[PDB]
Curated annotation (Swiss-Prot), chain B:
Single Gene Ontology MF annotation: tRNA (guanine(37)-N1)-methyltransferase activity
Pfam families recorded: tRNA_m1G_MT (PF01746)
Function: Specifically methylates guanosine-37 in various tRNAs.
Organism the protein comes from: Bartonella henselae (strain ATCC 49882 / DSM 28221 / CCUG 30454 / Houston 1)
GO BP field: tRNA N1-guanine methylation
Entry keyword set: Cytoplasm, Methyltransferase, S-adenosyl-L-methionine, Transferase, tRNA processing
Name of this protein: tRNA (guanine-N(1)-)-methyltransferase
Length: 215, 224
C-alpha cells in the first residue's frame, strides 16, 4: 500500500482527476489508498480573525490539532502553503518511497503558527503562485507521487531542459524534421541535441543554467 | 466572459475541482467557461521520436488539426517541463486576456514544429514530473480564474504577493489566547500598527532568509 491521508474542508475534491487514467486504476487496485478527513468535524468553526489584523481568516490551532490527533502519526505531516519549501522531483521520489503521506489543506490566508511548531507540520509549496485552497496543491503533490509507485533522474535536475523533439510526418507545413536527426550520425545527433538544450535553458531558465555551470 | 479551451486526451478530468467551491460558483454565474477538445478526434496521437529518444512524441499534424478546429482568439500555452515557470505575475497577465487555450502534453515530447507554427508558449508549474498536462492545466486555471475581474472579493485585492517582493508571508495567530503553553506575541495585541508591521517583517525576513535564500536574494536586490 501507499496510504494518502488528506485533511481538508472539501473531501469531495478527492480523489478528483486521480480517479481517472492510470492513477485511478492503481487506486481501484489498491496500489495506493486515499483517506480524507473533514476538518470541520473537529470544531467543538474552523478559522478565525487574525490577531493584529490581516487580509483573511487564520486556521485555528485547536481545531487542527484535534483533527491531526484523531489520526495515527504514520507519515510525514505536510502543510500545503505558499511559505513551504518548493516541491521538486528529488522530493517526490523521496516521498514515493514511503508507506504514506499526510497532507493538511489550508484554505484561508494562513495557519496558526503555534500548531505548525507543536505538530511538526512541514510547509510545502508547489510554486510561487496563489491557488484557491491547499487542495489544489495536494492533488498535485499526490499526482507527482502516485506516478512513481511500482505499478529516473530528470534532465532539469542536471540543469538542462530537454532537447527539441520530432516525429512524423517528415514534413508538416513546409517544415521538415531537422536532417541531422535522420543521419544515423550519433555523435552529430548528440552534439546537436546538447547545443539546442543549452541554448534553450540559457534563454528560458537561466536559474537552471546557473546550476548547470556550478559544475 | 473568460474563455478557457483545454486540449486534452482526458476531457473527463474537467472541470474537476474547478467545478467546486468559488471557481465553480463563478462558472455558474458565467464569469468564465471551460470547453474541452479531445485531441484523439483528430487521429494515433503520439509516435516514434526521430533519431531515438525515451518516449513517444505528440504529432504536429494531430495538434494542428485540433487547434485549427477552433479560433485563435486566445494566447496558446503548452503544458510542459520545458516551459517558463508559472508565477503570480504571469497568472495576472493571462487573467487580463479574453481567454486562454491550454494544450496538454501527455506522453513526454511534443513535435517542435507545432510549437513553432502555432506559437505555443511552453509553461511549467514547477520542476517535478506530473502524470500529464491535465494536472498543469487545472493548476493554471485555478490560479487565473480567482483573478478574473468578475469574481467577488476580487475588486479590492492585493495586486502583488509578498514573495514577489522577496519575502514569505509573516507568521499568523488566532484564538485561543494560549495553545499548549504558547501565547500570541503580545505586540500583535498592542494596538500599535507600526510595531506590528515591523515585527511581522522581521519574522518574515528571518523565515525567508532560512527557507528561501532565492527569494531573499531578490529581497536584497529590491531594497537597494
Amino acid at each position: 500500500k501507499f496510504q494518502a491521508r488528506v485533511l481538508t474542508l472539501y473531501p469531495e475534491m478527492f480523489p478528483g482527476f486521480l480517479g481517472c487514467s492510470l492513477a485511478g486504476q492503481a487506486l481501484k487496485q489498491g496500489i495506493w489508498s486515499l483517506e480524507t478527513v473533514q476538518i470541520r468535524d473537529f470544531a467543538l468553526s474552523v478559522d478565525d480573525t487574525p490577531a493584529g489584523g490581516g487580509a483573511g481568516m487564520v486556521m485555528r490551532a485547536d481545531v487542527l490539532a484535534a483533527a491531526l490527533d484523531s489520526c495515527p502519526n504514520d507519515s510525514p505531516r505536510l502543510l500545503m502553503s505558499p511559505r513551504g519549501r518548493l516541491l521538486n522531483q528529488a522530493y517526490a521520489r523521496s516521498l514515493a518511497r514511503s508507506s504514506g503521506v499526510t497532507l493538511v489543506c489550508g484554505r484561508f490566508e494562513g495557519v496558526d503558527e503555534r500548531i505548525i511548531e507543536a505538530r511538526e507540520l512541514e510547509e510545502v509549496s508547489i510554486g510561487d503562485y496563489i491557488l484557491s485552497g491547499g487542495e489544489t496543491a495536494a492533488l498535485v503533490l499526490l499526482d507527482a507521487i502516485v506516478r512513481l509507485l511500482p505499478g529516473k533522474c530528470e534532465s532539469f535536475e542536471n540543469g538542462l531542459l530537454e532537447h527539441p523533439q520530432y516525429t512524423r510526418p517528415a514534413v508538416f507545413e513546409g517544415r521538415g524534421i531537422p536532417p541531422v536527426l535522420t543521419s544515423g550520425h550519433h555523435k552529430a545527433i548528440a552534439n546537436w541535441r546538447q547545443q539546442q538544450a543549452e541554448s534553450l535553458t540559457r534563454q528560458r531558465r537561466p536559474d537552471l543554467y546557473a546550476l548547470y555551470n556550478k559544475n
